[PDB]
Amino acid sequence: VKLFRASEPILSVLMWGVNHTINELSNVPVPVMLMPDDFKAYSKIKVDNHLFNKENLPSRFKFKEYCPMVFRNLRERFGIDDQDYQNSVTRSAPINRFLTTYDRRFVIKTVSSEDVAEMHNILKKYHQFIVECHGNTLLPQFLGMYRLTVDGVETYMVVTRNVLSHRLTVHRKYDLKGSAREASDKEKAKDLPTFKDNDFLNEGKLHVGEESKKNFLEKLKRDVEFLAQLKIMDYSLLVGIHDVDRAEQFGPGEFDPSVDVYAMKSHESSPKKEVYFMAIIDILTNPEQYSKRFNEFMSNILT
Amino acid sequence: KVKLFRASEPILSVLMWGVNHTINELSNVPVPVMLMPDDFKAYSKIKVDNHLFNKENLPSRFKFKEYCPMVFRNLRERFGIDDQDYQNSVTRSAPINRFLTTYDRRFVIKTVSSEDVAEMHNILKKYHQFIVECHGNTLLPQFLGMYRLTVDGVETYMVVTRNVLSHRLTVHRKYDLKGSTVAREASDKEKAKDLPTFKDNDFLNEGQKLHVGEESKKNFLEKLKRDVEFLAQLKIMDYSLLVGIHDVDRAEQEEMEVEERAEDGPGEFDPSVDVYAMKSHESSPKKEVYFMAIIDILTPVNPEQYSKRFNEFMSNILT
Ligand SMILES: Nc1nc2c(ncn2[C@@H]2O[C@H](COP(=O)(O)O)[C@@H](O)[C@H]2O)c(=O)[nH]1
Ligand SMILES: Nc1nc2c(ncn2[C@@H]2O[C@H](COP(=O)(O)O)[C@@H](O)[C@H]2O)c(=O)[nH]1
Ligand SMILES: Nc1nc2c(ncn2[C@@H]2O[C@H](COP(=O)(O)O)[C@@H](O)[C@H]2O)c(=O)[nH]1
Numbered sequence: 001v002k003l004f005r006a007s008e009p010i011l012s013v014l015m016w017g018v019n020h021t022i023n024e025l026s027n028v029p030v031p032v033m034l035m036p037d038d039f040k041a042y043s044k045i046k047v048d049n050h051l052f053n054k055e056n057l058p059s060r061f062k063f064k065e066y067c068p069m070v071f072r073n074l075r076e077r078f079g080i081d082d083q084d085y086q087n088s089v090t091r092s093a094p095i096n097r098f099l100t101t102y103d104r105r106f107v108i109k110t111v112s113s114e115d116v117a118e119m120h121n122i123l124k125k126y127h128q129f130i131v132e133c134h135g136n137t138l139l140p141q142f143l144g145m146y147r148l149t150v151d152g153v154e155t156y157m158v159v160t161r162n163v164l165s166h167r168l169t170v171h172r173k174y175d176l177k178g179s180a181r182e183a184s185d186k187e188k189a190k191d192l193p194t195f196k197d198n199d200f201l202n203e204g205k206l207h208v209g210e211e212s213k214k215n216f217l218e219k220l221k222r223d224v225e226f227l228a229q230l231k232i233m234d235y236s237l238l239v240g241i242h243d244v245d246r247a248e249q250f251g252p253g254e255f256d257p258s259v260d261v262y263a264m265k266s267h268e269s270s271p272k273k274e275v276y277f278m279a280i281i282d283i284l285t286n287p288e289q290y291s292k293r294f295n296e297f298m299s300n301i302l303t
Numbered sequence: 304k305v306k307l308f309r310a311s312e313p314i315l316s317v318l319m320w321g322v323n324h325t326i327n328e329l330s331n332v333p334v335p336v337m338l339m340p341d342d343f344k345a346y347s348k349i350k351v352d353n354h355l356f357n358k359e360n361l362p363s364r365f366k367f368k369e370y371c372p373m374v375f376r377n378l379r380e381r382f383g384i385d386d387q388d389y390q391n392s393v394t395r396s397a398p399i400n401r402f403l404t405t406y407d408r409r410f411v412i413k414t415v416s417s418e419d420v421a422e423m424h425n426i427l428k429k430y431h432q433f434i435v436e437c438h439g440n441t442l443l444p445q446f447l448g449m450y451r452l453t454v455d456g457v458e459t460y461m462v463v464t465r466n467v468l469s470h471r472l473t474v475h476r477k478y479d480l481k482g483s484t485v486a487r488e489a490s491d492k493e494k495a496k497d498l499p500t501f502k503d504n505d506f507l508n509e510g511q512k513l514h515v516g517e518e519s520k521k522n523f524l525e526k527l528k529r530d531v532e533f534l535a536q537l538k539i540m541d542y543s544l545l546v547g548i549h550d551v552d553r554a555e556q557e558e559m560e561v562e563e564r565a566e567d568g569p570g571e572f573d574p575s576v577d578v579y580a581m582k583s584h585e586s587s588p589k590k591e592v593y594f595m596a597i598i599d600i601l602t603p604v605n606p607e608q609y610s611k612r613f614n615e616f617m618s619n620i621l622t
C-alpha cells in the first residue's frame with residue numbers, strides 16, 4: 001500500500017506521478033529503437049477527485065512526463081531498473097528546491113521552463129552520446145523530466161542519479177569551474193560547506209591511482225568536448241570527500257560501485273584514507289574556451 | 304505481463320484501461336471501517352492526453368470517471384468478489400458481446416443512459432444497506448462498478464454486474480418474465496435467433512415448469528419476497544426475472560461433438576461462482592440447471608402492485 005504521504009502536496013503528486021508513469025510504461029513494449037517523435041512526446045494525466053482519496057493527494061492536480069520513451073531508455077542505459085527507480089521515489093517521501101529520494105539514490109531538482117526547453121534541445125544529441133560512450137560518462141544522468149501542476153501552479157523537475165554516495169557520509173564537498181570563486185562567510189557556516197576553486201586550490205589534494213587518473217581524465221575529456229560541441233557552458237565538477245577514519249569514529253570505505261557510480265578509492269601509497277565522488281553537473285544553460293579551462297583545472301587535482 | 308488493452312473498439316480499450324487504473328489506485332486506499340455519507344456522492348476522474356506516445360491501442364485522448372468508488376469496492380467485498388479477480392476478468396482480454404461480457408463470462412458490462420446513472424445514485428444508499436442486512440443474499444443485480452468513459456468527446460455510461468448466467472455451463476433456453484396482464488411474447492424475429500429471449504406467454508404457452516425441490520424453492524421464494532418488496536419500497540418498476548435453463552444431457556452431448564470436431568463436473572457448478580444456479584429436483588424429468596435472478600431495476604398499474612403481480616407469477620413458475 002502506497003499512501004504517498006508527504007510533507008507537501010507537490011511531493012505527493014511527484015510520488016503519485018512517478019508511480020503512475022512507471023506502471024503505465026510497464027505496459028508499453030520496449031521498442032527496437034527510439035524514433036524522432038519520441039523526442040517530441042509526452043504523457044499528460046489530469047486528476048479530478050471529488051470526495052475521494054484526499055488523505056494525502058490533492059483532489060485536483062496534473063502530471064506531465066516529457067519524452068517517457070527516451071528517459072526510460074536512458075534509465076536502462078544507465079543500468080537502472082524501472083521498478084527500483086519507482087520504489088526509490090514512492091516508498092517514502094523524498095527529503096531535503098533540491099530533493100533526494102529517501103534512500104539518497106536519486107536527486108530531484110526543480111528547474112525552470114527554459115531548463116526544460118534547453119533539455120528538449122539537447123536530448124537527441126545527449127542520448128546519442130550516451131549510446132556511443134556505453135553509458136560511461138561523468139555527465140549528469142537524466143532519468144526523467146516532469147511537470148507538476150498543483151493548485152494551478154506549474155513546477156518542472158529533473159531527476160538525476162546522485163553524484164554523492166547514498167550511504168557514505170560526505171565530509172567536504174567542492175564545486176569547481178576551473179576559471180574569482182570562494183565560499184561565502186554565511187555559506188561557511190553550516191556543516192555541509194560547498195567550496196569553490198580558490199578554497200580548494202589555496203587549501204592544497206586528491207589521490208586516485210594512475211589507473212583511476214587515466215579513466216577519469218579520459219572520461220572528462222570526451223564529456224566536456226561534447227558539452228563544447230553543444231555550445232553549452234557554466235557547469236561545475238561536484239567533488240565529494242569521504243574520509244574513512246572520521247567515519248569509524250557494514251564496514252567503512254565499503255561501497256557498491258554499481259550504485260555509487262562516481263565513487264573512487266584513495267590510492268594505497270597515499271596520505272589519508274578516503275573515497276572521492278566526482279561528476280559534472282548543471283549543464284542546462286567562450287564555451288570551447290570554458291572546456292579547456294575546465295579540463296585543465298581538473299587534471300591538476302589528480303596524483 | 305504486459306497489458307496492451309487491445310480491443311475491437313476504442314471504447315473497450317478505455318474500459319480495460321479504466322478498470323485497471325482504478326482498481327490499482329484503490330489498492331493504495333485503506334479499507335474503511337464503514338462507509339461515510341459522502342462516499343455516496345464521491346467520484347474519481349482522470350483525463351489523459353498522450354502526445355506521440357502509447358497510441359497503439361489506447362486513444363491519445365480520453366476521460367474515465369468512476370462513481371462512488373468506495374461504495375462499489377465494498378459491494379464487491381460483500382459479494383465475495385476480490386478486486387484483483389475483477390480487474391483480471393476485465394483486463395486480461397477484451398470484453399466480448401450495448402451489452403458486454405468479460406472474456407471469461409463472469410461479469411456483465413451494460414451500457415446505460417444518464418437517467419440510469421442518476422437512478423443508481425438515488426437508490427444507492429438504500430441498496431447498499433439492503434445488501435448489508437441480507438448479507439449478499441438476493442436475486443437483485445449485484446452492482447460492482449459504475450463508469451463514464453469519454454472517447455472522441457462522446458460520453459458512455461456503463462454499469463458492471465455479476466453474470467446471472469453461469470460462466471461455464473451453456474444455456475439452452477432463456478426467458479424474460481414480468482407477469483403483466485399485457486400480452487408479452489417473443490417476436491417472430493426474436494424466435495428465429497439462435498438463443499431467443501422468450502417471454503411470459505411463451506413460458507405459459509409451453510407448459511414450462513421448473514423442478515427445483517422444496518428446500519431450494521423456499522430459499523428462492525424468500526429472497527424474491529424481500530427483493531420485490533424492496534423494489535416496491537422505491538418507485539422502481541418494470542424489472543424482470545431472468546430465467547436461463549441448462550440441459551445437462553444436451554450439454555454432455557454437445558461437449559462430445561465438440562471434441563470430435565476439434566480433434567481434426569457434469570450438470571454441476573460452484574455456488575460461490577454461479578450464484579443464481581439451482582439443480583433440478585432428484586425427481587425431475589430432465590437433469591437440468593436453472594439460473595434465475597431479477598434484472599432491469601434501473602427505472603422509476605403501480606410499483607406496490609407490480610411487486611405483488613411479479614411475486615405471485617414467479618413463485619408459480621416452480622415446483
Ligand atoms: N523543443 C521543445 N521544447 C519543449 C517541448 N515541450 C516543452 N518544451 C519547452 O519546455 C518549456 C515547458 O513547456 P511546457 O511543457 O510547460 O509546455 C517550454 O519552454 C516549452 O517550449 C518540446 O516538445 N520540444
Ligand atoms: N547530494 C547531492 N547533492 C548535490 C548533487 N548535485 C548537486 N548537489 C548539491 O547542490 C549544490 C550545487 O548547486 P546546484 O549546482 O545543484 O544548483 C551543491 O552544494 C551540492 O551540495 C548530487 O548529485 N547529490
Ligand atoms: N444523485 C446523484 N446523481 C448524480 C451524481 N452524479 C451524477 N449524477 C447523475 O448522473 C447523470 C450523469 O452525470 P455526469 O457524470 O454525466 O455529469 C446526471 O444526469 C446526474 O443526474 C451524484 O453525485 N448524485
Ligand SMILES: Nc1nc2c(ncn2[C@@H]2O[C@H](COP(=O)(O)O)[C@@H](O)[C@H]2O)c(=O)[nH]1
Nearest residue numbers: 402411465466467468477479500545598599
Ligand atoms: N448473459 C447474461 N445476459 C443478460 C444478463 N442480463 C440481461 N441479459 C440479456 O442481455 C440482453 C439485454 O438485457 P436487458 O437490456 O434486457 O437488460 C437481454 O436480451 C437479456 O436477455 C446477464 O446478467 N447475463
